[PDB]
Amino acid sequence: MLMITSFANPRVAQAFVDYMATQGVILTIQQHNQSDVWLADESQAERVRAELARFLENPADLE
Amino acid sequence: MLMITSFANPRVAQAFVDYMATQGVILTIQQHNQSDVWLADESQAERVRAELARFLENPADLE
DSSP: OEEEEEESOHHHHHHHHHHHHTTTOOOEEEEOOOEEEEESOHHHHHHHHHHHHHHHTOTTSOO | OEEEEEESOHHHHHHHHHHHHTTTOOEEEEEOOOEEEEESOHHHHHHHHHHHHHHHTOTTSOO
16 A cells, blocks of 8 residues: 555545546545544633533443 | 634534633633644655645645
8 A cells, every 4th residue: 555645625635536446547535534622711721621521431422 | 912722623612612602701612723634655655755745836726
């Protein structure tokens, strides 16, 4: 497996592998997925931290 | 800005910032987006590398 190239968009990625597959060349795409949570109110960082940890152990809504 | 935490799903991320925002705490989420193109046919890795490089500079369809 040799990395052909790296893209930052689905339309492009898909389009590429699309015209390539129809041309007789099979390609693969890897769409990353990660949701980073950041706060601006440091003072509230503590509140969110606690509540968050207490929510993470409560798999019902977040999930 | 202090990173509160990191998640691997939209539902969770949104849900979290949701219950946090309605509680008087504003939060932010960062949904990573990256499409990595990899090939299995090394022999074709060449023909693809050229065609791809020529297509990348041709913003019309891929875009």
